[PDB]
Amino acid sequence: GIFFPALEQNMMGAVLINENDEVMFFNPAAEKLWGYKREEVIGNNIDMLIPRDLRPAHPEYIRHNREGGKARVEGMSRELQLEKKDGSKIWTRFALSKVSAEGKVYYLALVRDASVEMAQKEQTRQLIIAVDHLDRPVIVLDPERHIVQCNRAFTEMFGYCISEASGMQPDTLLNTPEFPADNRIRLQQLLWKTARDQDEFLLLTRTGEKIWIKASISPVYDVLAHLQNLVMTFSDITEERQIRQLEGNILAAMCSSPPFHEMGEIICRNIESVLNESHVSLFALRNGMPIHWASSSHGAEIQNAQSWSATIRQRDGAPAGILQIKTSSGAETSAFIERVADISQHMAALALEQEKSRQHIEQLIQFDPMTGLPNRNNLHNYLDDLVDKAVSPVVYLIGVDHIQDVIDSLGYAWADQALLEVVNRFREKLKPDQYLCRIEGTQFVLVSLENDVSNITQIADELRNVVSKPIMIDDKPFPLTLSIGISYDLGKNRDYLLSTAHNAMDYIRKNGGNGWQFFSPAMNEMVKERLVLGAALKEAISNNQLKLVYQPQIFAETGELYGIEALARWHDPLHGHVPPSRFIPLAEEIGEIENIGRWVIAEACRQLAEWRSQNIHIPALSVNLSALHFRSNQLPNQVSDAMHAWGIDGHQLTVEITESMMMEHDTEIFKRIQILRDMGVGLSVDDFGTGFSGLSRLVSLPVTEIKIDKSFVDRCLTEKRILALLEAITSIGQSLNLTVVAEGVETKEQFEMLRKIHCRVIQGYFFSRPLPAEEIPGWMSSVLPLK
Amino acid sequence: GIFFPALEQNMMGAVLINENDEVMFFNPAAEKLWGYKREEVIGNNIDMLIPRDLRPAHPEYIRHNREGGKARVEGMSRELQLEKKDGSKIWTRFALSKVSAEGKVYYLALVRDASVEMAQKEQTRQLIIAVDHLDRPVIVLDPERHIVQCNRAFTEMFGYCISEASGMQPDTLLNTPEFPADNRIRLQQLLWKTARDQDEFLLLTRTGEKIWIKASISPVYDVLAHLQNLVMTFSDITEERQIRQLEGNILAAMCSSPPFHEMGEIICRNIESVLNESHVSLFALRNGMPIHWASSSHGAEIQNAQSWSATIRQRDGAPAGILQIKTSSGAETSAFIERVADISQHMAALALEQEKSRIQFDPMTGLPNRNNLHNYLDDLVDKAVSPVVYLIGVDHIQDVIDSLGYAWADQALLEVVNRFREKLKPDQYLCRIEGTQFVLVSLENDVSNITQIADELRNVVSKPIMIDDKPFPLTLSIGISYDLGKNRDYLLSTAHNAMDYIRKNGGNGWQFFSPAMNEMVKERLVLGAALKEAISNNQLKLVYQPQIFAETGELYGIEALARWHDPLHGHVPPSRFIPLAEEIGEIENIGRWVIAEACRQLAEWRSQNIHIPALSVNLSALHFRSNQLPNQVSDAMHAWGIDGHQLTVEITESMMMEHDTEIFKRIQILRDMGVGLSVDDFGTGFSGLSRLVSLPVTEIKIDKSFVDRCLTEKRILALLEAITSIGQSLNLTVVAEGVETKEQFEMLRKIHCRVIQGYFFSRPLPAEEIPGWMSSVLPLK
Numbered sequence A: 001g002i003f004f005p006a007l008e009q010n011m012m013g014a015v016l017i018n019e020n021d022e023v024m025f026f027n028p029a030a031e032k033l034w035g036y037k038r039e040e041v042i043g044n045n046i047d048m049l050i051p052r053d054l055r056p057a058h059p060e061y062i063r064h065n066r067e068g069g070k071a072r073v074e075g076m077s078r079e080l081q082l083e084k085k086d087g088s089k090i091w092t093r094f095a096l097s098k099v100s101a102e103g104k105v106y107y108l109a110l111v112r113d114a115s116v117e118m119a120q121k122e123q124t125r126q127l128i129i130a131v132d133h134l135d136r137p138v139i140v141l142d143p144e145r146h147i148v149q150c151n152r153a154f155t156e157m158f159g160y161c162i163s164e165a166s167g168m169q170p171d172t173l174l175n176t177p178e179f180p181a182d183n184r185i186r187l188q189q190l191l192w193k194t195a196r197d198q199d200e201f202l203l204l205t206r207t208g209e210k211i212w213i214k215a216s217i218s219p220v221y222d223v224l225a226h227l228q229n230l231v232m233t234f235s236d237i238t239e240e241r242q243i244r245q246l247e248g249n250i251l252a253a254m255c256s257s258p259p260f261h262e263m264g265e266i267i268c269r270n271i272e273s274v275l276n277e278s279h280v281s282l283f284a285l286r287n288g289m290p291i292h293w294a295s296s297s298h299g300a301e302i303q304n305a306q307s308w309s310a311t312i313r314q315r316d317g318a319p320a321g322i323l324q325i326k327t328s329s330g331a332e333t334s335a336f337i338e339r340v341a342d343i344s345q346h347m348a349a350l351a352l353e354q355e356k357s358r359q360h361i362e363q364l365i366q367f368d369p370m371t372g373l374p375n376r377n378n379l380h381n382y383l384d385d386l387v388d389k390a391v392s393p394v395v396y397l398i399g400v401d402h403i404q405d406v407i408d409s410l411g412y413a414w415a416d417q418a419l420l421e422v423v424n425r426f427r428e429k430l431k432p433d434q435y436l437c438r439i440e441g442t443q444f445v446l447v448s449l450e451n452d453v454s455n456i457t458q459i460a461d462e463l464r465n466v467v468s469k470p471i472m473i474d475d476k477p478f479p480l481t482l483s484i485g486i487s488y489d490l491g492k493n494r495d496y497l498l499s500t501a502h503n504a505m506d507y508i509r510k511n512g513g514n515g516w517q518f519f520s521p522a523m524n525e526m527v528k529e530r531l532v533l534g535a536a537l538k539e540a541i542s543n544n545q546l547k548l549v550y551q552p553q554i555f556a557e558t559g560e561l562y563g564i565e566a567l568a569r570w571h572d573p574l575h576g577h578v579p580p581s582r583f584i585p586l587a588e589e590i591g592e593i594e595n596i597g598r599w600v601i602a603e604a605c606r607q608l609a610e611w612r613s614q615n616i617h618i619p620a621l622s623v624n625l626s627a628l629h630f631r632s633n634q635l636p637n638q639v640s641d642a643m644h645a646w647g648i649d650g651h652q653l654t655v656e657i658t659e660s661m662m663m664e665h666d667t668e669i670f671k672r673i674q675i676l677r678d679m680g681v682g683l684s685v686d687d688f689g690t691g692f693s694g695l696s697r698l699v700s701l702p703v704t705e706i707k708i709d710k711s712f713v714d715r716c717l718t719e720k721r722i723l724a725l726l727e728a729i730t731s732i733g734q735s736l737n738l739t740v741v742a743e744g745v746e747t748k749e750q751f752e753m754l755r756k757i758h759c760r761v762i763q764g765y766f767f768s769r770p771l772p773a774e775e776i777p778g779w780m781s782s783v784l785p786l787k
Numbered sequence B: 001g002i003f004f005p006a007l008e009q010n011m012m013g014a015v016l017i018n019e020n021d022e023v024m025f026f027n028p029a030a031e032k033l034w035g036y037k038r039e040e041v042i043g044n045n046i047d048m049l050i051p052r053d054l055r056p057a058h059p060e061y062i063r064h065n066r067e068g069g070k071a072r073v074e075g076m077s078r079e080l081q082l083e084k085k086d087g088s089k090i091w092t093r094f095a096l097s098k099v100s101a102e103g104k105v106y107y108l109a110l111v112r113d114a115s116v117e118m119a120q121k122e123q124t125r126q127l128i129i130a131v132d133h134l135d136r137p138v139i140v141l142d143p144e145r146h147i148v149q150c151n152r153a154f155t156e157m158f159g160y161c162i163s164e165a166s167g168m169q170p171d172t173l174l175n176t177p178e179f180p181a182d183n184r185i186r187l188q189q190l191l192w193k194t195a196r197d198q199d200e201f202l203l204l205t206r207t208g209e210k211i212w213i214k215a216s217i218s219p220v221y222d223v224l225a226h227l228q229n230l231v232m233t234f235s236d237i238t239e240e241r242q243i244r245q246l247e248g249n250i251l252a253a254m255c256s257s258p259p260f261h262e263m264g265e266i267i268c269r270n271i272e273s274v275l276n277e278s279h280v281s282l283f284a285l286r287n288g289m290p291i292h293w294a295s296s297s298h299g300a301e302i303q304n305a306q307s308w309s310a311t312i313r314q315r316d317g318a319p320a321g322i323l324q325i326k327t328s329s330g331a332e333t334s335a336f337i338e339r340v341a342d343i344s345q346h347m348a349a350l351a352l353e354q355e356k357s358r359i360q361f362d363p364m365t366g367l368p369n370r371n372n373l374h375n376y377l378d379d380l381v382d383k384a385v386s387p388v389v390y391l392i393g394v395d396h397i398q399d400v401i402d403s404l405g406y407a408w409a410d411q412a413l414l415e416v417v418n419r420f421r422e423k424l425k426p427d428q429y430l431c432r433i434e435g436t437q438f439v440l441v442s443l444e445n446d447v448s449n450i451t452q453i454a455d456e457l458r459n460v461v462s463k464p465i466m467i468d469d470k471p472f473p474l475t476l477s478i479g480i481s482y483d484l485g486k487n488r489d490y491l492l493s494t495a496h497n498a499m500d501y502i503r504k505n506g507g508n509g510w511q512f513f514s515p516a517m518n519e520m521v522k523e524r525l526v527l528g529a530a531l532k533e534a535i536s537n538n539q540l541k542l543v544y545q546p547q548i549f550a551e552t553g554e555l556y557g558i559e560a561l562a563r564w565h566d567p568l569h570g571h572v573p574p575s576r577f578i579p580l581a582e583e584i585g586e587i588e589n590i591g592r593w594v595i596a597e598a599c600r601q602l603a604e605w606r607s608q609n610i611h612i613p614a615l616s617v618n619l620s621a622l623h624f625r626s627n628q629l630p631n632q633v634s635d636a637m638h639a640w641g642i643d644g645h646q647l648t649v650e651i652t653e654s655m656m657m658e659h660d661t662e663i664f665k666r667i668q669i670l671r672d673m674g675v676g677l678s679v680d681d682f683g684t685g686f687s688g689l690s691r692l693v694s695l696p697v698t699e700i701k702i703d704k705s706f707v708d709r710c711l712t713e714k715r716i717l718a719l720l721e722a723i724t725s726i727g728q729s730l731n732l733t734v735v736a737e738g739v740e741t742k743e744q745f746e747m748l749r750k751i752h753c754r755v756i757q758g759y760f761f762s763r764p765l766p767a768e769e770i771p772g773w774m775s776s777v778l779p780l781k
């Protein structure tokens, strides 16, 4: 038969199944398909050829095509996935037909492997999903200029599916508005133009409103240089204009640099304004976490809404935030979603970087633009550094009182003018170790490492006196007042210190101000007791209840007495004995040093006079003016008044200075001490001064004595070099005819040392502890010459 | 057999042709296809079925297949347009197979009604056509994140294509720079996002080019809601990032709110970066007419120049300025040019709006501000002070600015000010005028002090200004202005003029404005170099001054003073060139040389007359430094035959116990070597006296300042008496310098000064004739 060779040598797999669905034939094309050999399946049910997972459903097809023939249909051709003997489920073209071989109900199947063309179709699928995700809408036309094929982009842009857009004139599909009439003519011209061209038209949507499109026709020829295809493409000009203006406006608002959440708010406002029927909410990255940053007030739920993602990223690296927008389907094309998303995302990156930059700028702004004092950030840094150093500072909060009333009356033009000299006065009395800051408004924070109560009271008093002179503006007095809250405790944090200071400040201010106060006692009792001491001391000086002690000093080699040096002393009926080392600083603090000096010199004169009444007794008497902080305003009158009201021959009494008060500074005490010298008072010192100028000054008004200090004498045994220093000092003494005194001598050993070093007088316990004022006439004649 | 119905009754169109191309079989499906009858087609030429327009060549194709073999291809399949008997033409798929009967050559053609094939071929066309028409790269990724799709846009913009890129991960396919901003991780995860996402990358072409791209990935799920593919679009954001950089940077500028002109210049520079080899001009509407705002520093001629212009308008649409660009033809695309133009337009409009919208202390570092500087200079002018003004501009800041923005340009300036403060002297008024410019006002005017200050300030910034491990090297331009009687504004203007000159010339340097003193400093540097050469060729000398006891008139010792003579400059005294030595940094060498020569001449004098008692070198007047005492005394004494105990040295108390004190132990070891000392003041109280008597000084040198005026000032007469007495009390020798007259000599012999020196006995004598004087007139009793 002619059919035998044609059927045998064929490239399409042919199979036949009987009415019972059993196979009886195979060909090399079928063997290339599936993989089974002919003999493996000849005369067997089709089931094994059927896919293993499809066999359960195949009997349904068998019944449908055998009991009713699928409503009397012989067969058909379509695509099907074939499982090759290797197990691969390849795609192929199958065909079925009904055949009456042997007069029975047989079925003939044809198969052709279609893997390559299936792959081509898959490539089509990928590119079409891309075309859907292909920003600007595009459509294709045959030379007859009828839309043959389109995309999801054009479908979104003009509400026309491919089923609606197949094979018709582009305008007929896109019913254009009649006004103006030239729209149709121009679009037909561009439609049948064979060269690439672009123009502007005024199309009308499926659903309504006019739009102005920028239509673009372009050609594509073939190998034979004939029109093969055309592309008509466009996306927009109207919403593109909208978004260009949107970006302009959002840039303008962002340039206005509004706060972080307000920036989010403006972004939301504009994004809603354009893509209405949508919700917007941005997340900022803080501590690496997504925090709700902004959200539009239009949070009403909208049916059929799709979320759309975007990542706000800074100049480099990980995300800085998450942008996401939910939009109602059909509001605008997916391409326009992508477009607005890009602009919003990058604009948000700019906004967040702006926020971070302003954060850093504010952090680095730790100073003041008006006064110039370091500001609260610097103060916190400084206190934290002090705590780390483990040094306990004392924080003073100084608050101005009258400045608010000044603002209320005359205004800031006077308030700031007052604060200028307020801070100037602060800085004038500032000290090298101190640290000043301006936390806020009319409040200041002063910091010092001094922890003594006696020093704290002094610093507070200086600060309080800063306003001792009322502020003068245009000859108008302004008596401002200061409320001072101090705090100092061990182990507390800067936060506690500041809070406590502020509370103390408010308490004292509301109490009346013009004053200072410690933390709540705490040590306010330690201050009350010291105030008690001060009041008692003032009363004591007024009543003249003090005691003056006396201390002989004797020549080292003769044993004869050279003189006596006096020392102030105070015995209290209540508190008992209190030393100068404590009540002289207290005298300075309570402003009684002038008085104590007066009294000590007076009593010295009393004793000298009464003793001369008896006999020559005292050759010379010494009183330590330096140890009593004797100021410039005291010397001439305070000495001469007594020296003359009673009878003292000048050379009888002597005074002592520490050479620091002697350096010129601004007192020029030189003249006062010269007057004392003229009266005949001996001059005693402890050092020679800065250099040649110092020595020349010392010799110019020739001083009489030079007093080696106990600090040197006691450590003489420790250090031989100090012995050399003393040798030099005594040698200079002999050179200039200066009497060299030594203080704090204690034992026979130091006495022998000074003997060999030619000290020429000794004062200290080793010969007599300072004996009370009345034993002197007995001790002198009963112990001298203490040879 | 079933072989017959399998074809005869088959609904699949199949035809057979023999060696003569005669149709031997024609199925009813073939009848349905063509329109012929089986009895009419059987035994006839295949051409009858072949389309008439194609029939003539069909026999030729059959003959070629029969004769040439064509590699014995078994079969093939493709589509073609069929022509029916009635004349109607239709499109049909088909396939050919080679069959043989009776040992001859036969051909079998099978036909399919191409409906899905036709539609899908039409589509494939339309789709490739559409994508190609558009010029946006796009690719597709399988679930394994492997590219399985490309387009002409992707291949042209990336070089790669499916032929090479098929089935390979995007990161590997996409070369990237060496972690410039750690974008490797960005690419890696973006290629792993499980939802539609988008960011930006830098990728390098096959040639390698840092081009910027906007990756937007979008997932597409199958019908059953499973991730099927990931379609990604690379938008060419080279231009778009130009837009970005433009805004971002100028927005940052706007936030920093610089001067109007500075904003304009920022715009100029970055727009120029955007448009290569272009020119930019900016005008603004002032007083109702366009007046210059700014312009690009570039002003050279442009070949094939193209001019574009735009009117900057406010929100209301009214004009606000005129921007213009000149670009070289072919350098930039028109689309790019227009985009940069309009973005610049609107952004700069916002900048102008910010300008329209827009206290005696710097709120950032802590220096005064221009108002305070003006007040300070005014308060100096009213007192008639002629302040020397150093206007310091910190150059290379632009790298800091572009790297970390104005917020950190502030940090850089903070570091600059912090480094400057540590050296700022008292009586020096440092303020910050604006941005990157500081004003240091000083009172001292002597040119030597001015130059020293300038050098110190330039040096203190020697070390890089490190910020967050990014040591930006910043440089200093120091304009100097100074002129008697000139006001604050002129001083500032001229200082800025000199600063502008040195900045444009390169910076990292300092410059006077006034040319007279500008050449004066040049001559001063000439003198410095001359002395530098002179010391190196060691042409110097040392004049001596014998000094004698006041009792026997016998020689006590000889001083050694430096000297330098040049044929060009003539005599240049030490009093003048020693500070020049300080400036040039050769004081150490001068000290070395004076020491060496004193020792050598001592040895030479030993070789004939060893009687030379002692030699004294005035280190205090020579500005000796801390670390040179021990070495360059010991070296000289050992090298020469001098005994060390023969020469002494002189040092003042300030240098004795200030500027640290390791100098103290160095003088300890010097005394250990045994060199006698000679002190000036032994000041600073009892501690000073302790040092004095602990390090045997062996002599005290009363200077001319005191020796003179002795007959007049009673206070200094008393000082002299006291100090002579102190020396006599110790075992110290007292020296009186600069005695000039017989009455002064008589007074000094009264106060018992031991050794006298000065012109009253001997003007200094050169290296020779010292022996003549010493041997002729020694006992000048």
Ligand code: HEM
Pocket (backbone or CB within 6 Å): A015, A017, A046, A049, A050, A051, A054, A061, A062, A065, A070, A073, A074, A075, A076, A078, A080, A081, A082, A083, A096, A107, A108, A109
């Ligand atoms: C890889 C092997 C096979 C697969 C994947 C497969 C799959 C299918 C499926 C899913 C259907 C339902 C309708 C359609 O998709 O066309 C069908 C229909 C059918 N199948 Fe199969 N089948 C295979 C093998 C066969 C063979 C070789 C025959 C031989 C007769 C057969 C007999 C039938 C019949 C008679 C129908 C009725 C279809 C109609 O009348 O339109 N099956 N097949």
Ligand code: HEM
Pocket (backbone or CB within 6 Å): B015, B016, B017, B046, B049, B050, B051, B054, B061, B062, B064, B065, B070, B080, B081, B082, B083, B096, B107, B108, B109
């Ligand atoms: C509408 C009907 C047909 C058309 C338009 C057509 C067209 C062509 C053309 C143009 C070629 C040249 C090779 C090529 O273009 O790839 C060709 C090849 C060939 N055709 Fe056809 N043909 C038709 C029907 C048939 C039929 C029914 C047969 C029966 C055997 C046949 C046998 C052949 C053979 C043997 C070749 C040689 C292939 C080769 O050498 O590569 N043609 N055909």
